[PDB]
């Protein structure tokens with residue numbers, strides 16, 4: 001570990017725990033292509049089990065970047081098209097409000113203001129059909145951006161239907177395995193239970209709860225080494241041997257919509273690098289934003305700040321990287337603390353190694 005990286009990581013990271021009371025953090029940094037791992041604290045304060053590089057954290061929203069890439073994959077394979085209407089992959093959806101609503105709307109949170117969360121009373125396929133059949137859009141499609149789980153959750157449920165495989169099974173055979181992410185799981189098995197860290201909310205130990213469309217939007221738990229390999233894949237997609245997966249990544253970093261100084265992609269968010277720090281810091285705080293369509297979707301711009309946040313009841317996660325300098329940083333922790341603290345911390349560390 002070079003002294004510069006080590007120093008700045010510690011002098012930036014240690015106060016964050018001290019101020020945010022975070023039980024355990026894993027922090028990986030990618031510099032000139034080489035990863036570096038750092039840990040702090042305890043994975044299980046009750047069983048005095050620490051946080052290691054094989055300790056699993058619930059990624060939460062950062063699962064949506066996985067769900068994006070897995071769709072772009074099927075775009076490359078020709079099984080699904082980003083322009084088709086929703087009803088072509090779901091004929092039983094006989095509601096007239098869905099007319100005009102493509103899969104780009106489903107993916108980039110521009111479907112007309114679909115709810116941010118899937119209701120807890122929705123458990124069976126029939127309940128899910130009625131939920132989306134009775135929903136009525138706030139706005140026209142393609143006009144306003146409302147971040148939502150249920151919009152992206154359905155995109156990833158429908159993006160694998162022609163291929164005949166479950167979403168877990170597609171994910172594993174088409175992204176997880178080929179990239180040698182062997183410790184990232186949708187459903188944690190008993191064998192890895194020991195690596196599973198408990199989240200702490202309000203002092204109480206908590207894990208992610210089963211839900212409708214939960215794998216598709218916030219069901220992906222992973223380890224700090226697999227996040228490092230995943231960032232390394234997203235830095236430079238040309239080294240992936242599989243041509244559909246490379247294209248799937250490259251599509252995921254494509255700018256489909258623009259709102260303020262941010263761009264919407266397939267699970268990721270892009271910013272023209274260099275960026276004003278304070279602007280994006282207030283942009284990462286927790287609403288209805290309207291978007292100016294980019295015709296046509298821009299291809300992946302190397303000199304971009306590509307980032308995404310992930311939050312769960314008991315965990316917080318942040319991933320950011322800049323292709324142009326071959327730099328990146330990921331933070332994962334078993335307490336959901338404010339996102340602008342993550343972002344401030346990423347910005348200082350990355351600016352120092354820049």
Ligand SMILES: Cc1o[nH]c(=O)c1S(=O)(=O)Nc1cccc(-c2nnsc2Cl)c1
Nearest residue numbers: 060061116117149286309310311312313
């Ligand atoms: C800004 C951001 O970026 N990525 C994120 O996850 C967030 S967040 O603040 O909005 N997290 C969040 C907020 C409210 C509800 C849920 C939820 N819905 N079904 S389960 C769970 Cl938990 C998740």
